[PDB]
């Protein structure tokens, strides 16, 4: 809808493909930028449309936010593993890698494991068991 | 780093399409959202039951003139 013409018929992007070097950085990644929306200066913008970029914007969400909550869930399930062993003061410096990998492959299916603790009420700690200040 | 290493076309440029919608919801016809005082066939443009937007034709001459600071190009 906007003035973000695709880079196929943008009259300022074809000069970036006209005089350019070759090696690996300005030939194959430049013809892959051709299906991207670009303004009046030939630079590929990132707009948010309804359906033409519905999943084109949702791949950087769903790919990142899975392995954002994969680092976070394997770090949460490791700190909870070493506190039931009653040795958490010394297991945080010397990382017990047979358990941290065991708590990593338990976090590979973390979206269907967080909601098993939300409906069971075990994700959050209740407010009368958390240290606070004089308030 | 992308402009420094030659490839200025590899910049991540997010077009601010939510505040380009605000100007297009007030009268800026430059982008082309074509809604709600950018669409003259709308309920907000005409104000169909009364048609008492006497401020509106003077306002749209101001927002769509490119010589003032009223709702600059974003």
């Amino acid at each position: 809808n906007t003035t973000l013409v695709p880079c196929y018929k943008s009259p300022a992007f074809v000069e970036r493909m006209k005089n350019a070097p070759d090696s690996y950085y300005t030939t194959k990644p430049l013809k892959a930028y051709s299906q991207l929306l670009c303004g009046e200066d030939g630079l590929p913008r990132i707009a948010l449309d309804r359906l033409s970029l519905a999943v084109d914007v949702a791949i950087p969400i769903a790919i990142f936010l899975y392995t954002a909550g994969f680092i976070g869930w394997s770090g949460r399930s490791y700190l909870q593993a070493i506190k039931k062993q009653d040795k958490a003061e010394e297991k945080e410096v010397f990382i017990d890698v047979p358990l941290f990998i065991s708590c990593m492959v338990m976090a590979l299916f973390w979206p269907m494991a967080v909601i098993k603790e939300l409906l069971a009420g075990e994700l959050v700690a209740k407010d009368e068991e958390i240290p606070i200040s004089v308030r | 780093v992308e402009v420094a290493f030659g490839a200025a076309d590899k910049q991540i440029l997010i077009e601010p399409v939510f505040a380009q919608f605000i100007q297009s919801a007030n009268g800026k016809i430059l982008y082309g959202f074509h809604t709600l005082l950018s669409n003259p066939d709308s309920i907000a443009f005409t104000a169909w039951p009364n048609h008492a937007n006497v401020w509106l034709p003077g306002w749209l001459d101001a927002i769509n003139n490119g010589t003032n600071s009223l709702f600059l190009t974003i």
């Binding site: 449309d49 309804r50 | 919801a25 959202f33 074509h34 809604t35 709600l36 066939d41």
Partner: peptide, 29 residues
Amino acid sequence: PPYTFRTAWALLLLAINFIVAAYYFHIIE
């Protein structure tokens, strides 16, 4: 408890967010 007043003000602001997002994707006019 079932939140009855916290909801229907949060999903009332989410409703106003969805009328503005209806004009944004040019769904309604």
